[PDB]
Amino acid sequence: DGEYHSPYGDDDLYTVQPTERSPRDPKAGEDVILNITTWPIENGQDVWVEWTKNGVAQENVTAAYDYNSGNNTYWKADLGKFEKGDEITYTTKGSTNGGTAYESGPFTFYVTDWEYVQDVTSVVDNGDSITLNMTATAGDFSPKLYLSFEDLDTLRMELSPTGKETGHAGKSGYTVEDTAEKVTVTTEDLSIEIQKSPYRMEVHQADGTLLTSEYTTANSLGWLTDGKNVINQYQNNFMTPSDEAFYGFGERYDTINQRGKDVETYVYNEYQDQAQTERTYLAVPFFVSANKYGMYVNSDFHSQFQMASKVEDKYSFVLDNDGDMTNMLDYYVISGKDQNDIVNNYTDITGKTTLLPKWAFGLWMSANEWDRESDVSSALSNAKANDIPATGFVLEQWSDEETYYIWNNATYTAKKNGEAFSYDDFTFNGKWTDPKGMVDSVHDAGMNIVLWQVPVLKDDGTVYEQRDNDEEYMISQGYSADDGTGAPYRVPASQWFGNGILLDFTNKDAVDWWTSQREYLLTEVGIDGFKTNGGEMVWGRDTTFSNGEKGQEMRNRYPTDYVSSYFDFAKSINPEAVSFSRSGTSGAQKSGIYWSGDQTSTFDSFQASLKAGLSASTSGVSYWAWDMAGFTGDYPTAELYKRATAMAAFAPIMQFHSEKSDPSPSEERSPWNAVARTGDETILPTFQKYLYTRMNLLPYIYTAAKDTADNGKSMMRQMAMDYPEDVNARDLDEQYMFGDDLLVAPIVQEGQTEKEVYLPEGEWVDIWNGGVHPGGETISYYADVDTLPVFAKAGAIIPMNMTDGYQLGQNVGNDLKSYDNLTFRVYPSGDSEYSFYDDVNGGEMRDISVSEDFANEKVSVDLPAMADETTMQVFSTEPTSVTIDGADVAKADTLDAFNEATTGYYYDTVQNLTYVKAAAKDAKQAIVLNGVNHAPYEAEFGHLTNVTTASDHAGYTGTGFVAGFDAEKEAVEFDIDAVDGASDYTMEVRYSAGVEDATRTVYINGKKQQITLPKTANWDTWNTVEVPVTLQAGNNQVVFDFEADDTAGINFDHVVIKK
Ligand SMILES: OC[C@H]1O[C@H](OC[C@H]2O[C@H](O[C@@H]3[C@@H](O)[C@@H](O)O[C@H](CO[C@H]4O[C@H](CO)[C@@H](O)[C@H](O)[C@H]4O)[C@H]3O)[C@H](O)[C@@H](O)[C@@H]2O)[C@H](O)[C@@H](O)[C@@H]1O
Ligand SMILES: OC[C@H]1O[C@H](OC[C@H]2O[C@H](O[C@H]3[C@H](O)[C@@H](O)[C@@H](O)O[C@@H]3CO)[C@H](O)[C@@H](O)[C@@H]2O)[C@H](O)[C@@H](O)[C@@H]1O
Ligand SMILES: OC[C@H]1O[C@H](OC[C@H]2O[C@H](O)[C@H](O)[C@@H](O)[C@@H]2O)[C@H](O)[C@@H](O)[C@@H]1O
Ligand SMILES: OC[C@H]1O[C@H](OC[C@H]2O[C@H](O)[C@H](O)[C@@H](O)[C@@H]2O)[C@H](O)[C@@H](O)[C@@H]1O
Ligand SMILES: OC[C@H]1O[C@H](O[C@H]2[C@H](O)[C@@H](O)[C@@H](O)O[C@@H]2CO)[C@H](O)[C@@H](O)[C@@H]1O
Ligand SMILES: [Mg+2]
Ligand SMILES: [Mg+2]
Ligand SMILES: [Mg+2]
Ligand SMILES: [Mg+2]
Ligand SMILES: [Mg+2]
Structure with missing residues (x-):
């Protein structure tokens, strides 16, 4: 039949x-x-x-x-x-x-068969664009390649195989040198060298440095054609040296460096095994090379990037087309001031990230099992009882599971012709007796709620009045896509929401209708946005959209049309509304948060999540989340939960989530449920430490969020984005930069406690304890299960919201309308500046600058007008005085006195931080710390040989001292920076010698001297001896030894390097 x-x-x-x-x-x-x-x-x-x-x-x-x-x-x-x-x-x-x-x-x-560009036969310079008239290797076309400048550092190529299309205008600030054999196109930033016979392009920086070039045998650039009716594909081919690394391509789970891979620009819903299958929900035809350029192929059609996957020294793109001979190939080679500027230039082309409200940057709580009001009440109660000041709340299992815009168990008179409901139309029953009141109670807790959505009208062949009514209307209006025969397009039967009808998000009337059905959720129920899931649902070549585009072109685009439509709609009603989505292509970044999708509770999955965030970052998707510790599989171990918590608190968006709809016991990845499931009570204080730390750093985090929106700098970045020339940074996928200043190194390996951290050149300071680490090597950091290595870059100015306790990890709550103690942590190094986004006070930029002058025992802070009291925490030795506007401010002897003071200063001996309180003033204030040196290098943080630490004599700095240190083969080794370049310095050695005069032997980069350490009154008396040393650039190896000609026990507190 x-x-x-x-x-x-x-x-x-x-x-x-x-x-x-x-x-x-x-x-x-x-x-x-x-x-x-x-x-x-x-x-x-x-x-x-x-x-x-x-x-x-x-x-x-x-x-x-x-x-x-x-x-x-x-x-x-x-x-x-x-x-x-x-x-x-x-x-x-x-x-x-x-x-x-x-x-x-x-x-x-x-x-079809391939035809390629042969020679440039003539160059036509039109002032805002250049045409290269070309011959072809086969066929009868007269190809034209158009060159234009999106900016003086960003080149656009547009190829018309038939020559019937014309390229776009760009900047006019170029010059041309056209000769018989070659044409060179020059701007202040680029030198484009084009050989004519055969055609071959090299892209250079203006100083001659090669960025990239087409493959050397030329005939690199081509199109696949029958010569008459269709152009089905395009390609170009490029030369690549063995060491070249390739980053981005959207969100990738397998590797951060795609060299060796065939990368498919193809959105796909792949559950759990994204890394193994090399698939992704979010695919972007843009990569950044550590050779200091980006390449963006401007098309929504599927492309394959062959990254030295065929020939060792060749990379290629192969771009699909629907056959239309008038569709030009359009791609950009993007340069810039640095790698992050390349990303910025890409966002000039495809869209900036839209700044989200600050609440989006606190903790999000989610669990699919929450399906009734009592579940929501319990989640809020549990958060409150466990001191978890979350800011985001997600409901998934909220609806009738038929229309997806009506609350579960709600009764109503069904409406025909896709007419919209208001709140008053419903009688609320059962699991949701008062959705408005439920949302109000979430807001009371200082949280904001989003509801789960899909882009499809569900049709599983069951009878359901409202859904049936909506479907009939949707079809009659042409609000679906078309299957190609005049019938509504349905999702293929085997897929998620198979047989469902997709809403055509290209159709403005369809979007208006679909969104109108959800209006009451925003206007009356008062929700704060949508979790717009799915979107990877466009199949079929003949599938046709209202914009005239078909399934090949629209598959990658559809999710971003869907996500952006909802994001814009929600914001139109509630300016503070946020979207939370998984799928998209270029431009996804304009429309809210992206999470890494459906992963298991394993360390392997954690590793893949971090790769996904780092690749998404390079691709311009900065507001990135993951389900911390995985949302499904066997419940995470306490170890995984703790490791994931620490990383998540230092990632762009922090969110827990769980898959199961009605499990027993609960599958919540909340910290209280993690305690219940694992039996490990210590999960709670570890979770609190990291969540509170994130809240302490929220002013820094949110300023970084604004910097993404303004300047294209992603919040979390793979190391080669900041250090592209650094050979050790190229492949790192277990550490990253967070904001401008913090190097974060999560432990993503099961059973690991010795964590390797690669430190780029410069000085890095442990933010938790003041341990100093000279850059330019891989260090080993001991991190137990509760510990996360995080370091601040030299010169960092980090805004913080602190309690009167003034330590990281102390709860400041979630009231985003005010600060507790607005604080700036400062690691002085030359002249540094920072623009703080003061969201509490109308979004004013506060420009802070620091001038480090340790050579003259001074650090100066230029504080702008502020609306709040401010506390500086400056990394340094103890001042002899502090002035504000020339006037001495009072030394506080205790933290209590400091807190009570209007202005003043206090010295934290454990952290080696000087606290300085300045009153709120509508004028600039000049803060000077006098008598200060670079903070001490603590002996207890040194590399120790046959020697241990103690803290049983008061008055030390840091956490203690090295004790006794009085036998041969005992050593304390320091990694020490020069304060101001290669020079002689004075090394202060702080010690106690309670019994008798002592001597120790010191080696400075291998050069030996013996030092005399006179007797102190007793073991509770510290003294400092000044030792002349010669220090070079970089890490100086400073070894204290007890040798055969040395004598007596000492307690060794620290060393200070000064002029
Ligand atoms: O950024 C500075 C350091 O921060 C962390 O350590 C902070 C703690 O440092 C001291 O004591 C630690 C030890 O008790 C031990 O359990 O762990 C680490 C390092 O272990 C080993 O390191 C050296 C070999 O590489 C050896 O010299 C040492 O004998 C080994 O035990 C120690 O740092 C202080 O005494 C504590 O008060 C302080 O809390 C981080 O773990 C460390 O790696 C950083 O360098
Ligand atoms: O009650 C609403 C809804 O709950 C579940 O879906 C919520 C999850 O949706 C996504 O994950 C799904 C995949 O997209 C599917 O392809 C398939 O693998 O199943 C999962 C479910 O885990 C999303 O990525 C997750 O974050 C959400 O928890 C049910 O699957 C739906 O049928 C219900 O309508
Ligand atoms: O649109 C379908 C239906 O929705 C509401 O009632 C929910 C309803 O769901 C099933 O049809 C069950 O059989 C009922 O027991 C539930 O009450 C509307 O009140 C109803 O008018 C409408 O037909
Ligand atoms: O040479 C002096 C002294 O050195 C060692 O003891 C150091 C030790 O002395 C007291 O116990 C203090 O309380 C500690 O803080 C010091 O580290 C030798 O063991 C000792 O024999 C000698 O007299
Ligand atoms: O109507 C198009 C449809 O045809 C085929 O499905 C058949 C099926 O193979 C038969 O075993 C029987 O069940 O009748 C169906 C037609 O209703 C294709 O297999 C199917 O993919 C296609 O959509
Ligand atoms: Mg630019
Ligand atoms: Mg439930
Ligand atoms: Mg606050
Ligand atoms: Mg305050
Ligand atoms: Mg010490």
Whole structure:
């Protein structure tokens, strides 16, 4: 009773339907097979193909039995091979015993082959664009390649194979040197060297440094055509040295450096095994090379980036097209001031990140199992009882699970013709008796709530009045996409929401309707945005959208049309509304948060999540989240939960979530449930430490969020984004930069406590304890399960919201309308400046500058007008005085006195931080710390040999001192920076020698001297001896030894380097 063949199937990249044509788009010399099905299985069935070649009727092709399966027979018809330009049209047919024939088709394909640019025959400079007139290696086209400047450092190439299209205008600030053999195009930032015969482009910086170039054999640039009807693909090919690293490509789970891979720009919903399958929800045809350029292929069609995956020194892109011969290839080679500036330039092209409200940057709580008011009340109560000041709240299991815009258990008179509901239309029952009151109680807790959504109208063949009404309206209005035959497009039956009808987000009227149905959720229920899931749901080549585009072009674009439509809609009603989504392509960054999707509770998954965040970052998707510790699989171990917590608190968006809808016991990845499930009570204080730390750093984090929106600098960055020339930074995927100043190194390996941290050149200070670490090597950091290595860069100015306790990890709550103690942590190093985004006070930028002058025992802070009292925490030795506007401020002897003071200073001996309180003033204030040196290098943080630490004599700095240190083969080794370059310095050695005069031997980069340490009154008396040393650039190895000619026990507190 039937026959079926459909040449492209669902056009899936990864799989085929069993009734497709192979190849889908035949090239010259390729054997063409047609897979055909008939049903039911019967003897005496014939299957054949009726067809024409170049309009000429051919002898029928008889199909061969392939296999039987289920109710069906599958057959193969072999059409043979074809030549470039052949136009084949066929109809597949089946009948039983000479009866009624069932057929599919007709279907046409045009047989293609590659044509490439040969030579540049002439150059036409039009002032805002340059045309290169070209010959082709085959065919009769007259190609034109157009060059323009999006900016003086960003080159755009537009290729028209037929020469019938014209490129776009760019900047005029270029000069041209056109010669017989070569044309050179120059700006203040770029030198574009184009050989004419054969055509070959090299892109150089203006100083001559090569950025990238086309492949050396040339004929690199080409298009796939029958020469008459279709252009089906484009390619270009580039030369790449062995060491070149390639970053970005959207959100990638397998690796941060794609060298060696064929990367598919193809959005896909892959559950749990994204790394293994090399798939992603969020695919962007943009990469950044550590050779200091980006490349962006400007098209929504699928592309494949072959990154030294075929030939060791070649990278290529192959870009699909729908056949339209008027669609130019359009790509950019992007330079800039640095790697982050390359990202900024990319965002000039594809869209800036939209700044989200500060609440988006606190903790988000989520669990699929929350499905009733009492679950929401319990979540709020549990958060409150456990001192968890979260700011975001997600509900997934909230709706009727039919319309997805009506609360579960709500009753109402159904509405026809897609008419919208108001709040008053509903009687609220059962699980949700008062959604408005429920939302109000979330707001009372200082949280903001988002509701889960999909872009599809569900249709599983069940009867459900409202859903049925909406479907009839949607179809009659043409608010769906079209399947290509005049019927609404439905998601393929085997997929998530199979048989459902996608809303055509290209259709403004459709969007207005769809969103109107949700209006009451925003205006009356008072929600704060949507979790817009899915979107990877466009299949089929003939699927047609209101914009005239079809399924090949729209698959990658659809999720971003969907996500952006909802984001803009929610914001139009509630300016503080935030979206939380997983899928998209270039431009996704304009529309809210992206999370890394569906992963298991394992360390392998944690590793893949971090790769996903780092690649997304390079791709301009900065507001990135993950389900901390995984949302499914066996419940995370306490170790994984703690490791994930620490990293999550230092990532752009912090969010816990769980998959299961009605589990027993609870699957919540909340800290209180983690305690319950693992039995490890210490999870709670560890979680609190990290969450409170994040809240302490929220002024810094939110300023970084604004810097993303303004300047294209992502919040969390792979090391080579800041240090592209650093050979050790190239492949690192277990540490990153967070904001401008913090190097974060999470432990993402099971059982690991010795964490390698690569430190780039410069000085890095442990933010938790003041340990100093000279850059330019990989250090080993001991991190137990509760510990996260985080370091501040030299010169850092870090705004913080602190309690009167003034330590990191102390709860300041979630009231985002005020600070407790606004604080700036400062690591003085030369002259540094910072622009603080003061969201509490109308979004004023506060420009702070620090002038480090340790050589003259001074640090100066230029504080602008502020609306709040401010506390500086300056990393330094103890001042002899502090002035504000020249006037001495009072030394506070205790933290209590400091807190009570209007202005003053206090010295934290454990952290080596000077606190300075300045009153709120509507004028600039000049703060000077006098008598200060670079903070001490604590002996207890040194590399120790046969020697231990103690704290049983008062008055030390840091956490203690090295004790006794009085036998041969005992050593204390320091890694010491020069304060102001290679020079002689004075090294202060602070020690106690309670019994008798002591001596120790010191080696400074291998150069030995002996030092005399006179007796102190007793072991509770410290003294300082000044030792002349010569220090060079970089890390200076300073070794204190007890050798054979040394004498007596000492307690060794610290060293200070001064003029
Ligand atoms: O950024 C500075 C350091 O921060 C962390 O340590 C802070 C603590 O440092 C001291 O004591 C620690 C030890 O008790 C031990 O358990 O862990 C680490 C390092 O272990 C080993 O390091 C050296 C070899 O590389 C050896 O010299 C040493 O004998 C080994 O035990 C120690 O740092 C203080 O005494 C504590 O008060 C302080 O809290 C971080 O762990 C460390 O790696 C950083 O360098
Ligand atoms: O009650 C609403 C809804 O709950 C579940 O879906 C919520 C989750 O949706 C996403 O994950 C789904 C995948 O997209 C599917 O392809 C498939 O693998 O199943 C998962 C469910 O885990 C999302 O990424 C998750 O964060 C959400 O928890 C049910 O699956 C739906 O049927 C319900 O309508
Ligand atoms: O739109 C369908 C239906 O929704 C509401 O009632 C919810 C309803 O769901 C199923 O149809 C069950 O059979 C009922 O027991 C539930 O109450 C509207 O009140 C109703 O008018 C409408 O048909
Ligand atoms: O040479 C003096 C002294 O050195 C060592 O003891 C150092 C030790 O002395 C007291 O116990 C203090 O309380 C500690 O803080 C010091 O580290 C030798 O052990 C000792 O024999 C000698 O007299
Ligand atoms: O209507 C198009 C549809 O045809 C085929 O489905 C058949 C199936 O193979 C038979 O066993 C029987 O159940 O009837 C169906 C037609 O209703 C294709 O297999 C299917 O992919 C296609 O959509
Ligand atoms: Mg720029
Ligand atoms: Mg529940
Ligand atoms: Mg606050
Ligand atoms: Mg305050
Ligand atoms: Mg000390």
